[PDB]
Design a protein around this ligand. Structure first.
Ligand SMILES: C=CCNC1=C2C[C@@H](C)C[C@H](OC)[C@H](O)[C@H](C)/C=C(\C)[C@@H](OC(N)=O)[C@@H](OC)/C=C/C=C(/C)C(=O)NC(=C(C)C1=O)C2=O
Ligand SMILES: C=CCNC1=C2C[C@@H](C)C[C@H](OC)[C@H](O)[C@H](C)/C=C(\C)[C@@H](OC(N)=O)[C@@H](OC)/C=C/C=C(/C)C(=O)NC(=C(C)C1=O)C2=O
Ligand SMILES: [Cl-]
Ligand SMILES: [Cl-]
Lengths: 213, 213
C-alpha cells in the first residue's frame, strides 16, 4: 500500500519553476546529486566514529552511477546514511524549506539556477532533466522505502518489496525526459563529473554495459 | 516463508561428485550457463510466433553477465522464458533426471566433465565454481521466485520480495568459491566466452564497474 502526502505549497511552486525552464546549464543536476551523496557518506562515517557497528550493514563507502538506457533511467547510488520512512516524509516535501521562496525570488531577479545548492534546495534540480524520480533508501534504523514524485502536488511513500536490497544508503532513480538522454552516455557523464565534482573524498563508480565482440 | 524440498537422491549424489572434484577445466560452467540462457531465449521467441504478446513483458532479447566482486558473486541474466514456481520445484531437483546416473557412470569410466551438457544435466556444472546458487526467475505465468541451493540434499523456493524485478527471465546468482575468483574479472570472462560461446544468436552483455579518474 502506498501512502500519499501533499507537498508544502512553495515546494510545488519550486518544482513547477524548474520543470518548465529553458535554462541552458542543466548538467549541474549531477553536481548536486553527487554532492548530496557525499553529504550522506560524511554523516555515516561521522556517526561511526562513536558507533563503528553502523558501518557493517555496508562496509564500503562509494558513489555509483548506472545509466539504464533501455528504460531511459539514470541511477545515482550511495552507501551513505539513508533515510527512514519518517525522514523521507518530513524532509522530502511535507515541511516548508528555509531556502525555497528566497531561491525563487533570486531566480526571478536573474540568479543562475546553479546557485540552487547554496539555497539548500539543490535536490529539486533533478527536475531539470527528469519528469519522474524514485528515491529508494535504507537507513540502519528502518526498512527499505521508495519515495516517488512526478513534480505534481503530491508524492507517495511505499515499503520496498520491488527493488534490490541496499545494505545501507540511497538510490536516486531518474526517469529522464526525452530531450535529456545525453546523460545516459558514458562520455557525457565523465565530462560532467570532471568539471563539477573534482574534490570528492569518495570513489565515484560508473557502471557500463559493453557487448562482447 | 520459504518452502523446502528434497533433491532426488541421484541429483544430490551428482552435486556431491562435482563439488568435490579436482577437475582442471572448470570454465565450461560458463559455456553451459550461456547455452541454457540461449535455450530459454529460443523458447520465448518461438512461443511468441503465435502469441506476440508474450514478448511485451521484456521486449529485448539478451544475455547479461554482471560480476559483483565485493560480494564474490557472478550473475548471469537472460530475458528468456523464465520458470514458474512449479517448474522450479519439478525441474530443478525433485524429479529424477534422465542423464544423471549415466553421466556419473561415464565420469567414473574417464569421461571429461565437459560432456555434462550432452547428458542434459549441465546446469549442475555451476558447482565446479560455486558453493551456493540462487536461481531468480520470472515467467509470464507467475510471480518472481528464488530457488536456492548449497549442494546439500535440499533446496528452498521463496516468493521474491528482495531482488530487482525481472520483466521476464532468469538470473543465475553464483556465490563463487574463494579459489574461483578469477571469473569475477572482465579479461577472464571474455576469454571464456570467445573459446566456448562463438555461435550464440543473442547479444552477450558484460556489465563493468570503472572508477572515474
Ligand atoms: C541543512 C543541512 C543538512 N543536510 C541537507 C538537507 C537537510 C536534510 C534533508 C538532511 C537529511 O535529513 C534526513 C539527511 O541528513 C540526508 C543526509 C540527506 C541527503 C543529503 C540527501 O540524499 C542522499 N541520501 O543522497 C537528500 O535527498 C536525496 C536530501 C535532500 C534534501 C533537500 C530537500 C535538499 O535539497 N538539500 C539538503 C542537503 C543537500 C543537505 O545536505 C537538505 O535539505
Ligand atoms: C530436455 C530439453 C529441454 N530443456 C532443458 C532441460 C529440461 C527442462 C529443465 C527445461 C526447462 O523446463 C521448465 C525450461 O524449458 C527452461 C528453458 C530452462 C532452462 C534451459 C534453464 O535456465 C534458464 N532459464 O536460463 C535451466 O535452469 C536455469 C534448466 C536446467 C535444467 C536442467 C536441470 C539441466 O541441467 N539442463 C536442461 C537443459 C539445458 C535444457 O535445455 C534441462 O534439464
Ligand atoms: Cl530547513
Ligand atoms: Cl528428463
Amino acid at each position: 500500500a502506498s501512502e500519499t502526502f501533499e507537498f508544502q505549497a512553495e515546494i510545488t511552486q519550486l518544482m513547477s519553476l524548474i520543470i518548465n525552464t529553458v535554462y541552458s546549464n542543466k548538467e549541474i543536476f549531477l553536481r548536486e546529486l553527487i554532492s548530496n551523496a557525499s553529504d550522506a557518506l560524511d554523516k555515516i562515517r561521522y556517526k561511526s566514529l562513536s558507533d563503528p557497528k553502523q558501518l557493517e550493514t555496508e562496509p564500503d563507502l562509494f558513489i555509483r552511477i548506472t545509466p539504464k538506457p533501455e528504460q531511459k533511467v539514470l541511477e545515482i547510488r550511495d552507501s551513505g546514511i539513508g533515510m527512514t520512512k519518517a525522514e523521507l516524509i518530513n524532509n522530502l516535501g511535507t515541511i516548508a524549506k528555509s531556502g525555497t521562496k528566497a531561491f525563487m525570488e533570486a531566480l526571478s531577479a536573474g540568479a543562475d539556477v546553479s546557485m540552487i545548492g547554496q539555497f539548500g534546495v539543490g535536490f529539486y534540480s533533478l527536475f531539470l532533466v527528469a519528469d519522474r524520480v524514485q528515491v529508494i533508501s535504507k537507513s540502519n534504523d528502518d526498512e527499505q522505502y521508495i519515495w516517488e514524485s512526478n513534480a505534481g502536488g503530491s508524492f507517495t511513500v511505499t515499503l520496498d518489496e520491488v527493488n534490490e536490497r541496499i545494505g545501507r544508503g540511497t538510490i536516486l532513480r531518474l526517469f529522464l525526459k526525452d530531450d535529456q538522454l545525453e546523460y545516459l552516455e558514458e562520455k557525457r557523464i565523465k565530462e560532467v563529473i570532471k568539471r563539477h565534482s573534482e574534490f570528492v573524498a569518495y570513489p565515484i563508480q560508473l557502471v557500463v554495459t559493453k557487448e562482447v565482440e
